[PDB]
């Protein structure tokens, strides 16, 4: 799941000059605090508490301080597909975005009128990498917009 | 009844003459009694 994926991405963690580590796992939802119309009338968010088991390890001795931690109130989706925030019903609209990948294209130059081809690598996060072909018939690269 | 509007380059002397007092504190208003603080911003 999404929460499990994010937690796995975060953990494990070790401090600079590693001597001890921490990790999170196993998200769990127990039950919604209140119901739909109670939240709508009383002007409160319709959320449920979230619990994650955190494990702390001491590399020197090999201890395990594993136990559950309260992550906060996660807003929940109603049967209609809406979020009740502060007693108001809200909708999250899907967003159209260019997917990450490698994209090639070509353009006709103005001076020489040669066909010049370029490629760009678009990541989710990271420096931008893009190659190019010049009108002098040379293959170059711009690294991190340099 | 205006004849003309002249723009120029303000000097230190002009800026000092425009002023009625030097601001030498970043305080704007005290937390209780919500009144302007002396020698700071909004000083009376």
């Amino acid at each position: 799941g999404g929460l499990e994926e994010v937690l796995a991405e975060l953990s494990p963690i070790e401090d600079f000059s590693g001597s001890m580590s921490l990790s999170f796992s196993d998200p769990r939802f127990d039950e919604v605090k209140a119901s739909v119309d109670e939240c709508k009338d009383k002007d409160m968010t319709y959320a449920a508490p979230l619990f994650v088991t955190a494990e702390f390890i001491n590399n020197n001795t090999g201890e395990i301080k594993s136990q559950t931690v309260f992550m906060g109130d996660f807003p929940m989706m109603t049967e209609k597909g809406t979020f009740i925030i502060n007693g108001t019903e809200r909708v999250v609209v899907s967003q159209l975005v260019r997917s990450p990948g490698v994209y090639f294209d070509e353009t006709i130059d103005k001076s020489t009128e040669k066909t010049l081809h370029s490629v760009k690598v678009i990541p989710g996060r990271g420096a931008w990498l893009e190659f190019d072909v010049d009108k002098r018939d040379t293959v170059g690269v711009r690294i991190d917009r340099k | 009844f205006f004849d003309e509007l002249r723009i120029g380059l303000a000097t230190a002397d002009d800026i000092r003459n425009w002023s009625y007092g030097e601001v030498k504190k970043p305080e704007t208003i005290n937390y209780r009694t919500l009144k302007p603080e002396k020698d700071g911003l909004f000083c009376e």
Binding site: - | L9, A10, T11, I15, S19, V23
Partner: protein
């Protein structure tokens, strides 16, 4: 400096530029530029023309270029940067007066550092910070990354108050909201006269 300290003088910061302007003669520069314009042909002529465009302004006037270096920044009246007590006790403040505060803070710290004789590195760093704060006060985001407060929205500087489509020129001077006016939907009246 150690070998020939008394044979020359050097400096950094706005003070050095102030000294340069103070000991910079404009008549000789204008004459030299004119002679280069009438003589030179290549890019030298264009550079001389562009430089003369600026030099002649100070030459043929009663104003000196010393105004480009500031020894006392002015402060706008508080009403134009109001601290209004919103309903319920909340306070809304124009971010302009925030910028001012920073300046003062830094300008105070420098006064302390010079007082107790801090090492030149710290004094220079403080002077640079004061320069940047004043720059952002006059025009935020021009040179470097704009100064931001809560969230990530850049602060509104003095220049921004009258710069573009919003501001004063095109929003409060050339067209404004007026009293004794209304608005409503229109329907066709066929029995009406043309007037």
């Amino acid at each position: 400096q150690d070998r020939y300290g008394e044979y020359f003088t050097g400096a950094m910061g706005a003070e050095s530029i102030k000294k340069l302007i103070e000991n910079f003669d404009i008549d000789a520069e204008a004459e030299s530029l004119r002679e280069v314009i009438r003589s030179g042909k290549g890019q030298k002529k264009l550079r001389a023309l562009k430089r003369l465009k600026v030099v002649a302004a100070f030459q043929q006037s009663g104003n000196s270029p010393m105004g480009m270096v500031l020894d006392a920044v002015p402060v706008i009246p508080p009403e134009l940067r109001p601290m209004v007590q919103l309903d319920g006790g909340r306070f809304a403040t124009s971010d302009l007066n925030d910028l001012y505060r920073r300046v003062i803070n830094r300008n105070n710290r420098l006064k302390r550092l010079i007082d107790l004789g801090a090492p030149e590195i710290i004094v220079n760093n403080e002077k640079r910070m004061l320069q940047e704060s004043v720059d952002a006060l006059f025009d935020n985001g021009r040179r470097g990354r704009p100064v931001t407060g809560p969230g990530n929205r850049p602060l509104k500087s003095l220049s921004d108050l009258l710069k573009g489509k919003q501001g004063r020129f095109r929003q409060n001077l050339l067209g404004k909201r007026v009293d004794y006016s209304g608005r409503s939907v229109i329907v066709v009246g066929p029995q009406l006269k043309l007037h």
